[PDB]
Structure of Polyprotein:
Amino acid sequence: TVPRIKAITSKMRMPKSKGATVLNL
Amino acid sequence: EHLLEYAPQQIDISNTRATQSQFDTWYEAVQLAYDIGETEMPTVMNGLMVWCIENGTSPNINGVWVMMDGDEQVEYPLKPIVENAKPTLRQIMAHFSDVAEAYIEMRNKKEPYMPRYGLVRNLRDGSLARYAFD
Amino acid sequence: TVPRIKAITSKMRMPKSKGATVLNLEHLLEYAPQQIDISNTRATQSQFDTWYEAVQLAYDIGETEMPTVMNGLMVWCIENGTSPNINGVWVMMDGDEQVEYPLKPIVENAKPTLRQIMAHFSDVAEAYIEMRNKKEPYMPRYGLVRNLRDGSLARYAFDFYEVTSRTPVRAREAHI
Amino acid sequence: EHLLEYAPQQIDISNTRATQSQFDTWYEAVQLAYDIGETEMPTVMNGLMVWCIENGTSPNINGVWVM
């Protein structure tokens, strides 16, 4: 078959303070 | 003495076909910017020269070009094909001018196949519809 | 015997990068895709997939009730062409009275344009007018402006007609 | 199945004739802005379509039309 492109996804970088999240998603 | 011992062909010097180095920089930068390696990358160019027959060598940069596979399509970004082709896309794809007129000769005998550049110019014979693409 | 001419063959010079070939010639011969699935007039399956899901959403009409809408769209887009104003409305007959719909989420989601998205319906549209011509004379509205004059060529002359290689040569002059 | 059971006419979809709703908003706003009610307003439109035959559908806005 044909070679499909493997698109990567840059992460939706959620901000953090010291190791935990900062939003109640 | 060396002038008489010197017969180079039109296709290896002229302006329409870009140089071997311009095609060498282009093809390595496309193999890189698709993350598709050797023995899997020449299958892609079988899809490129069929697409560039039809829609010509002037797309928008942000657009996409398709390639049939079975029944469903795939897609690819047109950004690293017209941004690496340093003269232009026309003068880089002119390396494929030998195979393309041998592709349509294959395609005309099964069914009538005018390329899309021919239908705009309104050519009217399926035998001259072999030398008129972009 | 007679001296036959020895015809030489200039090579079918396949392009190369650094010493190896650039095409899979085995798969090239096992590869015959059609005009309609690659060309520029018909937009891609993904461009029609984003368009149709964004229309189903922005009308709040679900599956098994949404394909009835597209029976009204391809009849309207035959007549008034694929260039309306964005704020306007398009109608759809039902019994005797009309309905209406907003033209805003049909030309704002069609990412190439409306013409290249409705060109998926180029197969059904010329099969719609062939149905319609036999009951009564039916020139589409794009034909009446261009002043075509026969009800049998009034099948291939609407706005969003893709010009494939199956078009008769009289019809491909009618667009250009 | 419904596509084959669907034959609408040119005049009810096309661009030249505006929609029934565009004519519905227009006719109610003319009946209002003349203070001429029902059974007296359709006599006015007998005068409008005779005038709009002759002077066309492009007058100045401030002008008048006779009957």
